[PDB]
Design a protein around this nucleic acid. Structure first.
Lengths: 116, 76, 163, 422, 98, 166, 67
RNA sequence: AUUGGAUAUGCCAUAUAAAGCGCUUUCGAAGAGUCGAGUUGUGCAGCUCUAAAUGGGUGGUCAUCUAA
RNA sequence: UUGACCUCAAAUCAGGUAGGACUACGCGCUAAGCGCAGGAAAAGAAAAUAACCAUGAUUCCCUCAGUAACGUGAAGCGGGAAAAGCUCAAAUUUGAAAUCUGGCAACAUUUCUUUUGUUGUCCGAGUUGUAAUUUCAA
């Protein structure tokens, strides 16, 4: 059995079109969600900064985004991750603040019943 | 210490129908089992039927449901 | 086989006269039927639609989880357990739970008689937690009979293995 | 006075609304050095305005440093019992009504699982008892207190007498000591109190006839209700051991058309003073309050002083009395009479007939069962009653274990005792 | 700017945080209701044949034999210690009312 | 309410109450067919926590398996073939003796409108859930193949991955 | 995009709710007997506060009645 | 000609409703012939025994998870 | 003598559903045999790693690494593709089974006279528990 890679450029194209399809659907908003900055978990890589999964509940509380409305504006929430140091908290609280600085959220239609 | 001895039954070589024994209910508990606070809902008119009354009223207003007088007079 | 004391205690049920008196009081506090309840709601719904406060009801409490929570709340004044639940484990603890929590209980005949009271096919257990002030004496008289005719009686027979 | 003091606008505005704009002698010698940050070792009598003495400068420091709940607790106040702590917490709520510093109270007998949930949110003004604070200090993860700057001790003599000698010593080690303001406070100046000051305060501190009724617990309220009905046209003041107990009893007695005033009010110091002044002005009336609320207040000419709940400080109570005195004594508490024999206090026994006790218990229980706010007040009054009883200084006299809870809850209006933790 | 930097480094200055306890860690804490339920069911259900043997061995002060049976029965000394302590409490409670 | 009492009673299985019931019920179960319908679960608490709701569309079937594959796995499969118009939900041990192990199987009717309209059990109507027991997709099927999360738990190995540029 | 979103907010900017006949008579009847400032005593009443609303829901009813 | 998700707008809207987040002198349930142990066959299965509640699992007293 | 419930039956009663074929790729039992699926399947929101400044469902790719381990042969980390979270059981709605299938009668609707619903009513299911609320992140 040999796995042959003749579809390496046909995969590349298909993934671009899936990105293009994803935009066509939600084109005013980014094709990817925002991610936190986390430090890799070892003595070898702990000096790097890499993308995490989602923001902690302490980070969202401090920024001002409740865990319910966080996902609706494309802010992932990782309940598993936590903040053992203040550096990670303030690094990612600022990240949410900057993202909200550039956010234009378009109003939705709200039910307004005639009576009380 | 240990004496490294061997027990009288060491492997190294009765009322099958007893009466009920009340070791726990022999004394009566004085207080409720739960300390959860009482909700206000038990001291107020039910919101289940208030929800049901309001959606019965809507059908009466829209004529989906024959009123008690109209239904009673229809039976005659 | 030899029936354990916790399963043999159900063979000594409540007698003729006391059960008849118990069910007489229960039938004055039957819950309200599905057909009647609708009629009461459409009467109130029609009143509010044309143009527009009530009193708390008084009915016997049923349901296994509901009643067991009422015993543990020290709210049930009288607990009536069917004697023929098909999986007996459903009520096997109810006499001992009632003993622990100081509630008068009785093991009465047939789930259907308890079932009839509450407009159901079958009721595993029934509890009386509150009665109208007019009938406080009747419930007190019945509870005394249950103590005398069920708890005072047997008593030793529930600790002996049956069969 | 208050205007002379340089407290911030929010503190000044609250102080005017909370109480008056004056300054007592105890305050006049305590606010200045506490505001400056110097250690204060005061010795003031009970009810001399000590609560505000260590509160206004402390809250001002909290505003001055601009503390936030994410910074943990910056102030800890230690009180010996729950009743004194609750009075302090009630006053602190009024003072912080205009500020933005979170406040909270951790006392024994409360909900530890919920107390810890409060702490991890940051409690910038903490009122505590020595027994429970050590538990939260050593056993709660998430409690930030390294940013502490002010420590206040209230009635240190009672703290050492009640049996917190080792509890304080353990707390000092855990609590930070560098650049932290401490303010001890105890009228007594015993050697052990000085030892606590040496281990806590920084060097160079700034120095500053009886009548009883033997009544079973079940009929305690019924006897009281009949007695109040009999003496409707007299000036009667009744002392209780809980502000939650007095709230319920006043609420219950107002429900059954026996209008009674109270110093409880709505935990508003202005309302309590207004009620007390009016009661003093009125020649006839009935008022219910606690010993702590009446502590430091001049008792007017009152025909009947009723001690419905045992006092917390028998040593102070015997001198407190020095019209007619009354004592609702339980058959399990007859040993308290022997204490008065040891204190050389004259007393006489009052007897009542079982026929005249207004047996409204069946109706009384129906009211509490039917009503919601009555049931919650009754439940909380019953809970706080027991907790004060278990926290009494006289273990040999007032034994909670020897108390029967079924009869106690019958007086409060319960067929069965509610489920309260300890 | 709303972008992420990947690699490099960050200020090694550290400030520890005291995180509160998670609700998942609350497992294994005995409840007042669950303690009540387990005591009721312990009484109602009766005892296993091996639990009766253990209780009679404890009754005759044969503790060494009682622990040998429980450890062989359950499968560990840790389980045996809890079973012996639970059944000994039952014996004392029954002996109060028997 | 009483479901907490039922589960703590189920823990004690050699107890006097449970041992008498296990012996008696094993006798009555042996007098029936190998696979027979049950009016109601004999352990309503275990059925309820495994997914059984007392509503139309749910079915309980009792089966006996010769003691000494997993017996619980074999109970689900044989009941699955018997009631082939039903999807198997779950299965739980109820009784045993020297010869037989007795299991009760919760099955749902996928063609019943009360199941087809409950969004909580809707998911089993989809054809990807035909014969979940036949594919090791139930609780005891998943455990049998060591499906789980951890360090305790084939094409990828033997292949030679030859990339385009190499 | 920014302006249309702001303008669309202005169009759908009346989040505030009017009262109904039942709500208005409920709060008004409580107001006439207890006043317009003592909501705590309003809540503790049971004869008039049949639905057993807390003082915070009574305040919203009172605040909402004016508009 | 069939439909997607949106937009504008009309008419209805059972809101006496339902939520999010402030606070707590109140509470906070968590899956058993399973886990585990002994022994055989290929973690899994068979057979014998069979649990616990700050417990249990898994890692280095601590950490970390929270099965059936 | 009647009725209620229970358990077991009968019907060419009404409405359904299962089988057999394909099987490149999937998942099982035991290359072959046997069983069962889909447009993917399986897996999946930690009884997971780690020992760090910690990470964060699953799957896939690269690397780790032909390394460790005991010729077999990984995995944590790291780079990437794609990203999405949730539902119950266990707590009384108890001031009200608030829940649901079906029959009948209307009405609406259609990839469609072929589809799919709404409202009303009656029986049945269900208190041995159907809804709402809650899922530990609470």
């Amino acid at each position: 059995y040999v796995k042959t890679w003749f579809n390496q450029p046909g995969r590349k194209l298909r993934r671009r079109q899936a990105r293009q399809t994803k935009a066509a659907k939600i084109a005013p908003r980014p094709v990817e969600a925002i991610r936190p900055a986390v430090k890799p978990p070892t003595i070898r890589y702990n000096m790097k900064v890499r993308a995490g999964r989602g923001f902690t509940l302490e980070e969202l509380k401090a920024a001002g985004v409740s865990r319910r409305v966080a996902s609706t504006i494309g802010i992932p929430v990782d309940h598993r991750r936590r903040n053992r140091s203040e550096e990670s908290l303030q690094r990612n609280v600022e990240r949410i603040k900057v993202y909200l600085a550039h956010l234009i959220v378009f109003p939705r239609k709200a039910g307004q019943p005639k009576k009380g | 210490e240990i004496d490294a001895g061997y027990s009288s039954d060491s492997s190294t070589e009765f009322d099958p129908y007893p009466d009920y024994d009340d070791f726990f209910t022999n004394t009566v508990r004085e207080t409720p089992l739960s300390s959860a606070p009482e909700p206000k809902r038990r001291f107020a008119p039910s919101k289940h039927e208030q929800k049901r009354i309001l959606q019965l009223a809507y059908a009466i207003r829209k004529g989906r449901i024959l009123t008690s007088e109209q239904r009673a007079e229809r039976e005659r | 086989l030899k029936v354990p004391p916790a399963i043999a205690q159900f063979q000594k049920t409540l007698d003729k006269n006391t059960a008849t008196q118990v069910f007489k009081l229960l039938n004055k506090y039957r819950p309200e039927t599905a057909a009647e309840k609708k009629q009461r709601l459409v009467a109130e719904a029609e009143a509010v639609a044309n143009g527009k406060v009530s009193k708390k009801p008084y009915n016997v409490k049923y349901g296994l989880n509901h009643v067991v929570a009422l015993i543990e709340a020290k709210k049930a004044k009288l607990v009536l357990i069917a004697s023929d639940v098909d999986p007996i484990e459903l009520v096997v603890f109810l006499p001992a739970l009632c003993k622990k929590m100081g509630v008068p209980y009785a093991i009465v005949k047939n789930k259907a008689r308890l079932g009839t009271v509450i407009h159901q096919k079958t009721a595993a257990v029934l509890a009386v937690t509150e009665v109208r002030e007019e009938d406080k004496n009747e419930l007190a008289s019945i509870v005394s009979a249950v103590d005398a005719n069920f708890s005072a009686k047997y008593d030793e027979s529930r600790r002996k293995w049956g069969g | 006075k208050f205007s002379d003091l340089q407290l911030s606008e929010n503190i000044q505005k609250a102080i005017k609304e909370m109480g008056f704009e004056t300054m007592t002698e105890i305050q006049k010698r305590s606010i200045p050095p506490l505001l400056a940050g110097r250690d204060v070792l005061g010795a003031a009598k009970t009810g001399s305005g000590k609560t505000l003495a260590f509160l206004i400068p402390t809250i001002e420091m909290l505003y001055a440093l601009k503390f936030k709940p994410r910074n943990g607790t910056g102030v800890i106040i230690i009180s010996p019992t729950r009743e004194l702590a609750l009075q302090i917490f009630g006053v602190a709520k009024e003072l912080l009504k205009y500020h933005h510093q979170t406040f909270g109270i951790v006392i024994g007998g409360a909900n530890r699982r919920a107390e810890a949930d409060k702490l991890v949110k940051g409690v910038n003004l903490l009122v505590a008892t020595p027994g429970r604070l050590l538990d939260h200090l050593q056993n709660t993860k998430g409690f930030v207190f390294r940013n502490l700057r002010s420590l206040v001790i209230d009635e240190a003599d009672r703290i050492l007498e009640i049996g917190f000698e080792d509890e304080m010593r353990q707390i000092m080690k855990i609590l930070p000591s560098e650049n932290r303001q401490t303010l001890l406070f105890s009228a007594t100046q015993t050697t052990k109190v000085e030892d606590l000051a040496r281990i806590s305060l920084k060097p160079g501190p700034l120095y500053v006839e009886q009548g009883y009724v033997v009544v079973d617990s079940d009929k305690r309220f019924l006897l009281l209700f009949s007695f109040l009905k009999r003496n409707l046209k007299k000036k009667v003041i009744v002392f209780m051991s809980s502000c939650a107990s007095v709230k319920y009893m006043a609420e219950l007695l107002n429900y059954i058309d026996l209008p009674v005033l109270d110093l409880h009010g709505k935990q508003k110091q202005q309302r309590r003073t207004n009620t007390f002044f009016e009661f003093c002005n009125a020649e006839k009336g009935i008022l219910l309050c606690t010993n702590v609320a009446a502590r430091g207040l001049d008792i007017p000419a009152v025909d009947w002083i009723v001690q419905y709940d045992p006092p917390d400080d028998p040593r102070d109570y015997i001198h407190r009395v020095g019209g007619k005195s009354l004592m609702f004594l339980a058959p399990s508490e007859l040993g308290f009479l022997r204490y008065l024999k040891t204190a050389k206090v004259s007393l006489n026994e009052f007897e009542f007939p079982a026929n005249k006790v207004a047996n409204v218990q069946s109706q009384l229980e129906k009211l509490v069962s039917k009503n919601y706010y009555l049931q919650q007040s009754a439940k909380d009054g019953y809970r706080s009653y027991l907790q004060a009883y278990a926290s009494y200084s006289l273990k040999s006299i007032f034994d909670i274990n020897k108390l029967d809870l079924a009869k106690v809850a019958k007086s409060f209006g319960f067929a069965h005792p509610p489920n309260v933790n300890i | 700017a709303p972008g992420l930097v990947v690699g490099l480094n960050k200020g090694k200055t550290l400030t520890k945080r005291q995180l509160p306890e998670r609700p998942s860690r609350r497992k294994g804490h005995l409840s007042k209701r669950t303690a009540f339920v387990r005591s009721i069911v312990r009484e109602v259900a009766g005892f296993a044949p091996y639990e009766r043997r253990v209780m009679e061995l404890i009754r005759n002060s044969q503790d060494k034999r009682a622990r040998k049976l429980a450890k062989k029965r359950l499968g560990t000394l840790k389980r045996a210690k809890g079973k012996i302590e639970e059944l000994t409490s039952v014996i004392q409670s029954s002996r109060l009312a028997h | 309410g009483a479901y907490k009492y039922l589960e703590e009673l189920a823990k004690k299985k050699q107890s006097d109450v449970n041992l008498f019931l296990s012996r008696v019920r094993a006798w009555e179960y042996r007098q029936m067919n190998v696979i027979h319908r049950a009016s109601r679960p004999s352990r309503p608490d275990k059925a309820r926590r495994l997914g059984y709701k007392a509503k139309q569309g749910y079915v309980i079937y009792r089966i006996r398996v010769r003691r000494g594959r997993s017996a619980r796995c074999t109970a689900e499969e044989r009941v699955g073939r018997y009631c082939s118009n039903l999807r198997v939900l779950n299965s739980y041990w109820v009784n045993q003796d020297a010869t037989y192990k007795f299991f009760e199987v919760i099955l749902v009717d996928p063609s019943h409108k009360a199941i087809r309209r409950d969004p909580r059990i809707n998911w089993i109507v989809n054809p990807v859930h035909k014969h979940r027991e036949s594919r090791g997709l139930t609780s005891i099927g998943k455990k049998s193949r060591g499906i789980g999360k951890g360090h305790r738990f084939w094409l990828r190995h033997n292949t030679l991955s030859l990339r385009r540029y190499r | 995009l920014e302006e249309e979103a702001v303008k669309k907010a202005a169009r759908q900017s009346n989040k505030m709710l009017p009262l109904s006949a039942f709500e208005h008579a409920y709060i008004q009847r409580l107001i006439n007997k207890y006043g317009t400032e003592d909501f705590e005593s309003m809540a503790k009443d049971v004869k008039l506060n049949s639905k057993l609303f807390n003082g915070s829901k009574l305040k919203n009813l009172y605040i909402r009645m004016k508009a």
